[PDB]
Design a protein around this ligand. Sequence first.
Ligand SMILES: COc1ccc(N(CC(F)(F)F)S(=O)(=O)[C@@H]2C[C@@H]3O[C@H]2C(c2ccc(OCc4ccccc4)cc2)=C3c2ccc(O)cc2)cc1
Ligand SMILES: COc1ccc(N(CC(F)(F)F)S(=O)(=O)[C@@H]2C[C@@H]3O[C@H]2C(c2ccc(OCc4ccccc4)cc2)=C3c2ccc(O)cc2)cc1
Lengths: 212, 223
Amino acid sequence: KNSLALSLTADQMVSALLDAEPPILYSSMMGLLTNLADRELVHMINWAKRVPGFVDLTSHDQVHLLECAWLEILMIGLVWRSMEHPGKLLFAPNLLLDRNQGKCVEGMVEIFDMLLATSSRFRMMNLQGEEFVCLKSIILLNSGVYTFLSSTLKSLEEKDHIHRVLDKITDTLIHLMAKAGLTLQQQHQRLAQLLLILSHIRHMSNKGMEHL
Amino acid sequence: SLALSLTADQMVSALLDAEPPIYSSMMGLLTNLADRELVHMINWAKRVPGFVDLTSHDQVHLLECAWLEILMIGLVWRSMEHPGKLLFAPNLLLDRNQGKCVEGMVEIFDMLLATSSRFRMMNLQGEEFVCLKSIILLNSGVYTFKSLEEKDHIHRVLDKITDTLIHLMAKAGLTLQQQHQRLAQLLLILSHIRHMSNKGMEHLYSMKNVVPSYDLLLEMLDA
Ligand SMILES: COc1ccc(N(CC(F)(F)F)S(=O)(=O)[C@@H]2C[C@@H]3O[C@H]2C(c2ccc(OCc4ccccc4)cc2)=C3c2ccc(O)cc2)cc1
Ligand SMILES: COc1ccc(N(CC(F)(F)F)S(=O)(=O)[C@@H]2C[C@@H]3O[C@H]2C(c2ccc(OCc4ccccc4)cc2)=C3c2ccc(O)cc2)cc1
C-alpha cells in the first residue's frame, strides 16, 4: 500500500470517523423498519467509503465486508441511539419501541431483548461517541475479513491491510482512554469489554437472519 | 469469591490444570465424540474461576450458549500443527474434501481451517488458548440471561482473564502497543468463532438430528 489511512494519528482517526457519521433518520412494523433500514443502507454505503482503509480494498472485498456487516451496523446504531432510553429501542426519534411491541412480529421479541441488553451494557459502561464510531468501523472491517476466498496473493495482501487498519483502530481506542485519564489496567480492561460486546452483536445479527 | 483473588500466574496454572483430555454415519461419529466431550466440558467449566458461584440456571445458560464454540476452538487448537486438516481426534484427522460427505459441512470446515491458520500465523500459545476458551464460556451467554449480581461477578472474572492475557504478553516481551494489539486481534477472532457456531446450527437445521438441549445440559451439571 501507499495508504494515507495507516499514517493517521488517533485524534485524526476519530475526527474522520466523527465527520463520516450518518444523520439520524425519521421513520406493518416490518414495513416501517424495512423502509427505515433501506434509507439507512444508502447512508451506510457512503459512510463505509469514508472509513480509512476501506476504499484501498477492491470492490469485491468492499462488498463482501458490507454484506457481512450491514445488519450488525444497523444494530449497533440502534443500540447507541437507544442508550438514554432504558427499556426502549429508538428506531427513529418518531419511532421509540418497548419490548412488548417486538411481540407483534414472529421471533422479534428475542432479538429486541438482546438489543436492549446491549443498550444497557453500553449504558453501564458509559460508552462515548468517539468509542462508538471506532466500534462501528471495527465491525465493518472485521466481520467479513475471515471469509474472503484466500488464494490469490492480492486477496492475501487485502487481509494484512485490514488487520493493520484494525490495529490502528485499537490504538485509537487506547488513546481515547488514556486521554480520558484511565490507567493502563483500566485501558486494557475497557478495550476487552468493548470488543467482547462485538461478539454479542455478531450473535444478534446471525439470530436475526435465522429468524428471517 | 476465592476465584477473583488469583494472580495472573495462578489463573493460568488453574486453567492449564482444568484442561479436558483429548478418541473418535459421519454425523454419528462426530455426535458420539462431541457427546462424550460434553461430559468433560461440564467438568472443565466447574473449574473455570467464578463458574460454580453462579446459579444452575445461569451455568446451564452459559453452557447452552457456548458448548459448540468451545468444541470448535478445541478442534482448531488441535488442528494447528496439521495445515489443511482438522484433527477431530488422534484417530480422526480429516481434510476439506471429507467435509463434503455431509451437506453443508464443507463450508463450516473451510471456516474451521481458516481459523486454524490464523492461530498458526499468530503463534497462539497454549496459555492464551485456555484464556480464550474461558472467555467464550463466560462471555457468550452473559448478555442473554440476584441475576444482576451474577453479571457483575462474570464481568469481574473476565477482567481478570484480560489482565492474565496482558501479563503473559508482557512476560513474553511484547511492548504495550503490541500487547493491546494482540489482545484485540485475539478477541476479534471470538466474533468469527461465534459466527461459525451459528452457521453450524443453521446448516444442521437445514439438513432429524438431535442437538443438546437445556434439559440435557442440566442433567449433566447435576451429576
Ligand atoms: C432484510 O434482512 C433482514 C434481516 C433481519 C431482520 N430482522 C427481523 C426478523 F426477521 F428477525 F424478524 S431483525 O434481525 O430482528 C432486525 C432488528 C431490527 O428488526 C430487524 C429490523 C430490520 C427490518 C427490515 C430490514 O430490511 C432491510 C432491507 C433493505 C433493502 C431492501 C429490503 C430490505 C432491516 C432491519 C431492525 C432494524 C431496522 C433499522 C435499524 O436501524 C436497526 C434495526 C429483518 C430483515
Ligand atoms: C448437534 O449440533 C450440531 C451443530 C453443527 C453441526 N455441524 C454439521 C452441519 F450440520 F453443519 F453440517 S458443524 O458445524 O459442521 C460441526 C464442526 C464439527 O463438525 C460438526 C461437528 C459436530 C457434530 C455433531 C455434534 O453433536 C452434538 C450433540 C451432543 C449430544 C447430544 C446431541 C448432540 C457436535 C459437533 C464438529 C465437531 C465435533 C467434535 C469436536 O470436538 C469439535 C467439532 C453438527 C451438529
